[PDB]
Amino acid sequence: MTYNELIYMVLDELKLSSDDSYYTPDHVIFLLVKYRSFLLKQRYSDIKKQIPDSDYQSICLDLIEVPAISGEPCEGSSYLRSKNKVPTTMMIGNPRVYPMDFYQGEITYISRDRMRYVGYNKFLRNIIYCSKAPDGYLYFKSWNPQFLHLEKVSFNAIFEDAKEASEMACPEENGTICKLEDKEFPIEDALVPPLIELVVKELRGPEYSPKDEDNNAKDDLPDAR
Amino acid sequence: MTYNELIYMVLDELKLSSDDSYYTPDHVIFLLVKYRSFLLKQRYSDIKKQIPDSDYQSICLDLIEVPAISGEPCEGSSYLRSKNKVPTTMMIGNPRVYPMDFYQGEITYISRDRMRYVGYNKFLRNIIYCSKAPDGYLYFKSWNPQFLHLEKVSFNAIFEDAKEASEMACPEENGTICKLEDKEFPIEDALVPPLIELVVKELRGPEYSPKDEDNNAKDDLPDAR
Amino acid sequence: MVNNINWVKLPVILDRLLRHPLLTDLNLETAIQYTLDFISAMGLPNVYVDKIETIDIKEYRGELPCDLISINQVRLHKNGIALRAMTDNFNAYPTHGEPSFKTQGRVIFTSIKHEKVDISYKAIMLDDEGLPLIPDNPIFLKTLELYIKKEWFTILFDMGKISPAVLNNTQQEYAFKAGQCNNEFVIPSVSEMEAITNMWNQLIPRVTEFRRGFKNLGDKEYIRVH
Amino acid sequence: MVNNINWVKLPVILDRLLRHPLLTDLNLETAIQYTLDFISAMGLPNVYVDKIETIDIKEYRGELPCDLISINQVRLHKNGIALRAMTDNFNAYPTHDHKGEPSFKTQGRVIFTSIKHEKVDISYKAIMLDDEGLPLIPDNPIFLKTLELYIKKEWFTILFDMGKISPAVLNNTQQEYAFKAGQCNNEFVIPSVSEMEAITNMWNQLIPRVTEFRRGFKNLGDKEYIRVH
């Protein structure tokens, strides 16, 4: 299913059908994406299970050769990094950087805390390591100088923001999708009715709360206006 | 039963008789498909039990030969993939790809993660492997170049979205079913009385909820109009 | 082994596993791997096929057959003298005797430069297809069934989908049938006990049976002490 | 060893591990380390390849090959006389008099001999490699089953310290590894029918042979014939 069906079954269950309503679809797109990450972390962090194929998003990345700090010679070897910032993956799935083919290539996405001591084994010196820096870009690393010829990679993980990874989405075979609401929502259908009920209960209470309607240079909420 | 026998039982238990209503059959098809996926995960994913023959759907697939990344020579060997995207499977039953004959052929539906290292045994070099890629397609892989002469398979599974798999359904002996509501609903009849009760409860409360009935450039939902 | 090894295909074992409705998601691709593990874990040499193949030694090295798994013996082709085992560390390395062999890859290292040898080896029996062929003995088939059921139920117990009283019962039931299959296939026949009864009963002992092709191990000592 | 050691690449072990849906985030990078931690812990000498290399000693020192793991024997290139081991604490160090048996000593990529200027032959053991620079593992499905269980044992230990695996699942994996890691030890060690002839000749000797190390252990398994009088 798409974003459009999930927005408009939260809205049509709340009956926010009027154009002049206080809670827009932009309230829901925020509250669906945050309650998705809340719902995935409560099911899949207690013990390890299978994540289905549906909670994941594949984003395409373009890499550029960047130095360690600047153009100085005694500062270290250079890296690769994505041109754009990368969404923060959740730590409950199988993140995977693959060279636009899922069933091929060994590019290993690791933690940022491990990557500063990596590749020192002699049988691990041709492997391309990944992590998302504090800057927000996915950095690439090897002891092999062949790795600096990568131009395009993809990235399949459980990202925190469903909205962030929908904008960096891989281009389809027909073409790129213009609207956000026409892209597939990354959650299993077995979690959609717990997801709808939480967002609706979040916004059913505030839906009938009084508004500061009077323009009197005065707070009118203590009088239930 | 069909979708129509299941749609109109929720519509008649809610007494949604009039065409001038807020909650259409399209609201009910969404909630009947997302709770079929929810009830099947709540029952059959805790411990291993028998799934009946009822919760399954068979979808027909036509296979096309695609390259690995592009038309390059050194990129790896070729694949097959379906022409259309495939519905995501629930991990509770026996998913099974069969060449239009359920009692013949060994095509092994595996995970996307296993399929990148597969068939390296000398006794498993003739077995075709399936997985649903992050693109959304079903890719086929074997070390035997005879597998590229497949033109049609089928796929029996417990899919997540029931509506996504009834649109790709296999053609019958008489002919195809043009109306979606005249196709069979994929759930066991011992799961329908808990399935109908959840869809009604999700819609019974919001059925009698107030609406913004007035065109006054102002939200009338706090005032319960 | 008393009984005979009649060969039946691999899908005879999935007649029996899919009798159990927790095991119905099995394939043949699953059954091939768990059967080859079983053939290795039991190690019963009446399940393999004894084959003989001669090869040519080029320079202390010869090319080995494809389906070789375990070599019974290697003997010289012109004489018949069997080669024992290379204890040397410096075999074909010169500075500035009795034949022996050593085999790791698809390569056999002898101590002889240019000869032909006879290799007696053991292979798996295959089908019309290129698939292994299991014995029909229901002692073998009941403990391969319980093996695949134990490797499957271990996976379901790791997921939390099987009570530990189910896995404890299956591990116990297989471990008796693992000993029963190890005993059915090892215990000598009536025809094979006389080959031991002729070897044990020896006044003048024979300690040179390896030089011949282990041929006269059950030949009888007809000792007229006069 | 009874069986032959056929070589298969490392992605055979990820056919078997990712059959388990809890181990699907295993990689080649994670499988390369856990294979080498396993091969070294098991220490079966039939997994290594036997190599012979002549190096030249400069001044009680020689430069050792790159792929070496362990030296079986060193010998002399001119005599064939094998070298034993250096028990001397004061090898190439002269007294101020500026003043018997060859011996050697090996620490890193250097060999420390008791001979000054001579060529030596080193019979060592390496890891067998692929087309890639990766280790190449045996084909035996006792080895592949207990390597599957070892990688499953160290991964499940990481999940148990996090709290994502019940204690009875690790305790069963530690048990099932423990048997197959002994059964793998018994498989790769117990001598063949061909290799028990080489022990029948060594063990049964009317006149004992106690200098096989001076040769290249060549006649360790040779039959000791006795004349009839």
- Which value in Å is the resolution of this experimental model? 3.6
Backbone phi, psi, residue A155, to 5°: -155, 115
Residue whose pair of structure tokens reads 């063949």 in the numeric block: D192
- Residue D95, CA atoms < 13 Å, CB-side half-sphere: 2
The span from the first CA to the last CA of chain D, in angstroms, equals 39
Backbone phi, psi, residue C129, to 5°: -75, 170
140-199 in chain C: CB under 8 A from chain B? 156, 160-162
Q: Check: CB of residue D105 under 8 Å from CB of residue D91.
A: yes
Q: Three-state SS for B105?
A: coil
Inspect the interface and report whether the beta carbons of C21 and B50 lie closer than 8 Å. yes
Measured between alpha carbons, how far is A150 from A99 in angstroms, rounded to an integer?
Answer: 8
Q: Check: CB of residue C126 under 8 Å from CB of residue B122.
A: no
Inspect the interface and report whether the beta carbons of D133 and A94 lie closer than 8 Å. no
Burial of B198 per CB tally in 10 Å (0-12, 13-18, 19+):
middle
- Using CA atoms, how far residue C213 sits from B96, C209, D57, D198, in Å, is 52, 7, 47, 16
Q: Distance (Å) from the C-alpha of residue C78 to the closest C-alpha of chain B?
A: 35
Amino acid (1-letter code) at residue C85: A
Backbone phi, psi, residue B81, to 5°: -150, 160
Taking CA–CA distances from D17, the nearest residue in chain B reads B114
Q: What one-character DSSP code corresponds to residue A170?
A: P
β-bridge partners, D82? D75
Sign of the CA dihedral D189, D192, D194, D197?
A: positive
Q: Check: CB of residue A60 under 8 Å from CB of residue A168.
A: yes
Amino acid (1-letter code) at residue B213: E
Amino acid (1-letter code) at residue A140: F
Measured between alpha carbons, how far is A25 from A180 in angstroms, rounded to an integer?
Answer: 12
Taking CA–CA distances from A125, the nearest residue in chain D reads D133
Q: Are strands D104-106 and C134-135 parallel, antiparallel or unpaired?
A: unpaired
Which residue of A16, A156, A189 to mutate against B (max B Cβ within 10 Å)? A189
Q: Distance (Å) from the C-alpha of residue C98 to the closest C-alpha of chain D?
A: 7
- The total number of residues written for chain B in this structure: 225
Q: Which residues of D fall within a CB distance of 8 Å from B124?
A: 15
Measured between alpha carbons, how far is D72 from D214 in angstroms, rounded to an integer?
Answer: 13
Structural tokens at position C159: 């997921």
Measured between alpha carbons, how far is A10 from A1 in angstroms, rounded to an integer?
Answer: 14
Taking CA–CA distances from B87, the nearest residue in chain A reads A54
Q: Which residues of D fall within a CB distance of 8 Å from C95?
A: 75-80, 121
Measured between alpha carbons, how far is C33 from D145 in angstroms, rounded to an integer?
Answer: 10
Q: Three-state SS for B44?
A: helix
* Chains in contact with C, where contact requires at least 3 CB pairs less than 8 Å apart: B, D
Q: H helices then E strands: how many in chain C? A: 5, 9
- Specify the experimental method: cryo-EM
Inspect the interface and report whether the beta carbons of D15 and B113 lie closer than 8 Å. no
- Residue C188, CA atoms < 13 Å, CB-side half-sphere: 8
Structural tokens at position D46: 């039939």
Structural tokens at position B51: 């799934």
Inspect the interface and report whether the beta carbons of D12 and B113 lie closer than 8 Å. no
Structural tokens at position D169: 């699942």
Q: Check: CB of residue B11 under 8 Å from CB of residue B199.
A: no
Inspect the interface and report whether the beta carbons of D18 and B120 lie closer than 8 Å. no
Chain centroid to CA D222: 24
Which residue of B21, B199, B212, B223 to mutate against A (max A Cβ within 10 Å)? B212
Q: What one-character DSSP code corresponds to residue C108?
A: E
**H or E stretch covering B3:** helix B3-13
Measured between alpha carbons, how far is A175 from D197 in angstroms, rounded to an integer?
Answer: 72
Measured between alpha carbons, how far is B115 from B99 in angstroms, rounded to an integer?
Answer: 20
Measured between alpha carbons, how far is A55 from A190 in angstroms, rounded to an integer?
Answer: 11
Burial of C224 per CB tally in 10 Å (0-12, 13-18, 19+):
exposed
- The total number of residues written for chain C in this structure: 226
DSSP letter string over B81-100? EESS--PPBPTTS--EEESS
* Sheet arrangement for strand D70-76: D49-56, D119-126, D70-76, D82-83
Q: Three-state SS for C195?
A: helix
Q: Check: CB of residue C134 under 8 Å from CB of residue C143.
A: no
Inspect the interface and report whether the beta carbons of C129 and B93 lie closer than 8 Å. no
Q: Check: CB of residue A193 under 8 Å from CB of residue B202.
A: yes
β-bridge partners, B193? none
Residue whose pair of structure tokens reads 């024979």 in the numeric block: C206
Inspect the interface and report whether the beta carbons of B123 and C36 lie closer than 8 Å. yes
Q: Check: CB of residue B118 under 8 Å from CB of residue B129.
A: yes
- Residue B142, CA atoms < 13 Å, CB-side half-sphere: 24
Neighbours of A224 (CB within 10 A): 8
Inspect the interface and report whether the beta carbons of B202 and A209 lie closer than 8 Å. no
Q: Using the CB atoms, write b or e for D185-210: b if 16+ within 10 Å.
A: eebbeeebbbbbbbeebbeeeeeeee
Structural tokens at position D103: 């011996």
**H or E stretch covering B61:** strand B57-66
Q: H helices then E strands: how many in chain A? A: 4, 7
The alpha-carbon radius of gyration of chain D (Å, integer) is: 23
Interchain contact D132–A (C-beta under 8 A) = yes
Taking CA–CA distances from A53, the nearest residue in chain B reads B88
Interchain contact D70–A (C-beta under 8 A) = no
Among candidate residues C60, C105, C95, C114, the one with its CA nearest the CA of residue D216? C95
Which residue of C87, C121, C153, C211 to mutate against D (max D Cβ within 10 Å)? C87
Three-point CA angle D197, D199, D200, nearest 5°: 60
Residue whose pair of structure tokens reads 């057959």 in the numeric block: C65
Measured between alpha carbons, how far is A148 from D73 in angstroms, rounded to an integer?
Answer: 44
Q: Which residues of C fall within a CB distance of 8 Å from B50?
A: 21-22
The span from the first CA to the last CA of chain C, in angstroms, equals 39
- Residue A29, CA atoms < 13 Å, CB-side half-sphere: 13
Amino acid (1-letter code) at residue B149: H
Q: Check: CB of residue C125 under 8 Å from CB of residue C132.
A: yes
**Longest CA pairwise span in chain D (Å):** 78
To the nearest 10 degrees (0 to 180), the angle between helices B25-44 and A3-14 is 110
DSSP letter string over D2-64? -B---EE-GGGHHHHHTTSTTSTT--HHHHHHHHHHHHHHH--GGGSEEEEEEEE-SSS-EEP
Backbone torsion region of residue A184, taken as left when φ is above 0, otherwise alpha when ψ lies between -120 and 50, otherwise beta = beta
User: In this complex, which of B91, B114, B119 lies closest to D18 when CB atoms are compared?
Assistant: B114
User: In this complex, which of B91, B113, B120 lies closest to D18 when CB atoms are compared?
Assistant: B113
Q: Check: CB of residue D216 under 8 Å from CB of residue D73.
A: yes
Q: Check: CB of residue B121 under 8 Å from CB of residue B165.
A: no
Q: Check: CB of residue D82 under 8 Å from CB of residue D217.
A: no
User: In this complex, which of B69, B198, B221 lies closest to A100 when CB atoms are compared?
Assistant: B69
Three-point CA angle A204, A206, A208, nearest 5°: 80
Amino acid (1-letter code) at residue C48: Y
Measured between alpha carbons, how far is A63 from A138 in angstroms, rounded to an integer?
Answer: 9
Taking CA–CA distances from B23, the nearest residue in chain A reads A12
Measured between alpha carbons, how far is B186 from D53 in angstroms, rounded to an integer?
Answer: 70
List all residues 6 or more positions away from D174 whose beta carbon is below 8 Å from its beta carbon. Answer: D153
Burial of B114 per CB tally in 10 Å (0-12, 13-18, 19+):
buried
Structural tokens at position A21: 């309503």
Backbone phi, psi, residue B221, to 5°: -75, -35
Q: Check: CB of residue A134 under 8 Å from CB of residue A76.
A: no
Taking CA–CA distances from B157, the nearest residue in chain C reads C25
Amino acid (1-letter code) at residue A145: P
Q: What one-character DSSP code corresponds to residue C10?
A: G
Residue whose pair of structure tokens reads 């029931």 in the numeric block: B162
Measured between alpha carbons, how far is C181 from C219 in angstroms, rounded to an integer?
Answer: 29
Backbone phi, psi, residue B153, to 5°: -125, 180
Chain centroid to CA D42: 9
The alpha-carbon radius of gyration of chain A (Å, integer) is: 22
Q: Which residues of B fall within a CB distance of 8 Å from A101?
A: 68-69, 75-76
**H or E stretch covering B107:** strand B107-109
Residue ranges in chain A assigned as alpha helix (H):
3-14, 25-43, 162-167, 192-204
Q: Are strands A107-109 and A128-132 parallel, antiparallel or unpaired?
A: parallel
Measured between alpha carbons, how far is A216 from D28 in angstroms, rounded to an integer?
Answer: 69
Q: Check: CB of residue D198 under 8 Å from CB of residue D221.
A: yes
Residue ranges in chain C assigned as alpha helix (H):
13-17, 29-42, 138-159, 164-184, 190-200
93-132 in chain A: CB under 8 A from chain D? 94, 106, 108, 121-124, 126-127
Chain centroid to CA C185: 11
Measured between alpha carbons, how far is A217 from B113 in angstroms, rounded to an integer?
Answer: 62
Structural tokens at position B123: 């006794």
Among candidate residues D162, D129, D100, the one with its CA nearest the CA of residue D39? D129
Inspect the interface and report whether the beta carbons of C160 and B94 lie closer than 8 Å. no
Measured between alpha carbons, how far is A22 from B219 in angstroms, rounded to an integer?
Answer: 7
Interchain contact B142–C (C-beta under 8 A) = no
User: In this complex, which of C72, C73, C84 lies closest to D221 when CB atoms are compared?
Assistant: C84
Inspect the interface and report whether the beta carbons of A108 and D27 lie closer than 8 Å. yes
Backbone torsion region of residue D5, taken as left when φ is above 0, otherwise alpha when ψ lies between -120 and 50, otherwise beta = beta
Inspect the interface and report whether the beta carbons of D18 and B119 lie closer than 8 Å. no
Measured between alpha carbons, how far is C196 from C207 in angstroms, rounded to an integer?
Answer: 14
* Chains in contact with D, where contact requires at least 3 CB pairs less than 8 Å apart: A, B, C
Neighbours of D58 (CB within 10 A): 10
To the nearest 10 degrees (0 to 180), the angle between helices C29-42 and D143-162 is 110
Q: What is the 3-state secondary structure (H, E, C) of chain D?
A: CCECCCEECHHHHHHHHCCCCCCCCCCHHHHHHHHHHHHHHHCCHHHCEEEEEEEECCCCCEECCCCCCEEEEEEECCCCCEECCCCCCCCCCCCCCCCCCCCEEECCCEEEECCCCCEEEEEEEECCECCCCCECEECCCCHHHHHHHHHHHHHHHHHHHHCCCCHHHHHHHHHHHHHHHHHHHHHCCCCCCCCCHHHHHHHCCCCCCCCCCCCCCCCCCCCCCCCCC
Which residue of C18, C29, C32, C154 to mutate against B (max B Cβ within 10 Å)? C29
β-bridge partners, A96? A156
β-bridge partners, D54? D121
Q: Check: CB of residue C53 under 8 Å from CB of residue C121.
A: yes
* Sheet arrangement for strand D104-106: D62-63, D110-113, D104-106
Q: Which residues of C fall within a CB distance of 8 Å from D3?
A: 69-70
Neighbours of B170 (CB within 10 A): 14
Q: Using the CB atoms, write b or e for A169-180: b if 16+ within 10 Å.
A: bbeeeeeeeeeb
Q: Are strands B107-109 and B128-132 parallel, antiparallel or unpaired?
A: parallel
Neighbours of C164 (CB within 10 A): 12
Q: Are strands C70-76 and C116-123 parallel, antiparallel or unpaired?
A: antiparallel
Measured between alpha carbons, how far is A67 from A76 in angstroms, rounded to an integer?
Answer: 8
To the nearest 10 degrees (0 to 180), the angle between helices C138-159 and D167-187 is 140
Q: Distance (Å) from the C-alpha of residue D193 to the closest C-alpha of chain A?
A: 37
